[model samples]
Target: DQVDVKDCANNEIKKVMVDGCHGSDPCIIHRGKPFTLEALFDANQNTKTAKIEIKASLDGLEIDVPGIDTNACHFVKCPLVKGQQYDIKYTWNVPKIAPKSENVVVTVKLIGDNGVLACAIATHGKIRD
Candidate 1:
């Protein structure tokens, strides 16, 4: 139902959901710290690995967050079993020259050799907190 956000030291910091359609949760972040995302897999789906991507915008204009490749789909190593959860760690370095606030969108697609197993969209506010 929800995912756990962790720090580099493996400390649990935030919990979020793999909300695909409607935006959910406020993905709060500090200016200079790495944020870890943890997601849980559905028991009904059989799979491994996740295709991840992030999209950001401000004032209705698309913006880019540093350190992420905006060109293509990025894959994160994850365990997709019937009843398990996994974590993916990434950092969004909001440069000093970046905006003070923006809208962030994340998509998680579970895939297998057959095709896309499942997908969801999550939304958040990237505040320069």
Candidate 2:
């Protein structure tokens, strides 16, 4: 489901899924393991600083996991083109210190130069050892 986040600069989120996972709801990610997120989205702005940031939230608190916030510039095409469709596969390790949760919501921030570009959210994620 595409959320109506105002001030966002991205459009037409075609897909957001965890690779090789069955039934993304309640994504069973193990601590200290690696996983990849695949996204097919459209860029509505053009900028070199167009990037992504991620956060995990539950019980009204935002948790910052280390590797998930790794700058997307390393995986994204530089100077994104307006109205262009880009598909990116981002991989990161589930750090041992990452919080274990029964129901955590993960949000992705597609940030543009002046404002946020888009958001991809996973609502039923569970992490474990």
Candidate 3:
């Protein structure tokens, strides 16, 4: 089955998936709930550090979420090695900054010291206002 994940780089990532609202569609985001995200990716270069960058698109605008964007190494093993597949998962809350009563597109980016490690996009996050 195909998962709704978009790759933002070439051969930098693979097997990107997330906990579905029911298994890959209708990913619901409630105002006062939490959700989990995970992705399996292969490292292209060694990095003593890494980070997570999050962006959400609403109605035609892309907004950067600083609160959600944080150090990824905190969740996973540090000093990523080349060709090693790292499984990273993050729990998220539908922050108040999200616009209400609209579908949202969210992008989760993994950035390493060398460059962008991976990126996955959720195209249909139906945020319940």
Candidate 4:
């Protein structure tokens, strides 16, 4: 289920979910544009490690955000007992892409004991291209 982060940026959807935790096809952004995205990673069950990868794309090109650390970047590691949960909230500004627009598209990928990916885009109207 793709979730929308409304009013995040001037009533614009600066961020969104890519997979809804059931599918792939994360969000995509431009090559080099000033942008930022954030979210909270909630653990469904007590897990050992959690990883969050921020993927980007522009004109159909995709790349991954550099890992600040294994247990927090490309791979987020956490040690918890059963029925425990962890929350992750962070943000980052992306480089500008070619032909920058007032808005862009982005996605969030959650990979731990389970893998979930989601995506969303900016909207000035009912829907976006």
The best candidate in terms of lDDT: 3
Q: Write the per-residue lDDT of candidate 3 for residues 5-117, one digit (tens) a residue.
A: 67676656576665656435766666556656776778767887878776777757777766553767877687888778787887765577666637777777888899877
When sorted by TM-score, best at the front, the candidate numbers are 3, 2, 4, 1
Error of 2 at 29 (Å): 1.7
TM-score, candidate number 1: 0.42
lDDT value for candidate 1? Answer: 0.41
Runs of candidate 2 exceeding 4 Å displacement: 1-11
Off by over 4 Å in 4: 1-38, 67-69, 73-77, 80-85, 91-104, 117-129
Report backbone clashes per prediction: 4, 0, 0, 19
The regions of model 1 sitting more than 4 angstroms off are: 1-25, 43-50, 63-98, 110-113
Residue 129 of model 4: what lDDT? Answer: 26
* lDDT-based ranking: 3, 2, 1, 4
- Output the better candidate (1/2) by TM-score: 2
Question: Per-prediction TM-score, please?
Answer: 0.42, 0.78, 0.84, 0.44
Tens digit per residue, CA lDDT, model 1, 1-129: 454332221222134343322224566545455444444333223454444334345536665445543221142334445344444444334434345566544443334433443444444556464
- Estimate every model's Cα lDDT from 0 to 1: 0.41, 0.62, 0.71, 0.39
The root-mean-square deviation over C-alpha atoms between each candidate and the true structure, in angstroms, is 9.0, 3.8, 2.3, 9.8
Model 2, residue 82: displacement in angstroms?
A: 1.3
lDDT (10s digit) by residue, model 2, range 1-129: 322222223444566766645543356667688877666667667767666666666436677656774456566785667678676677756667656676666666777675565667666666666
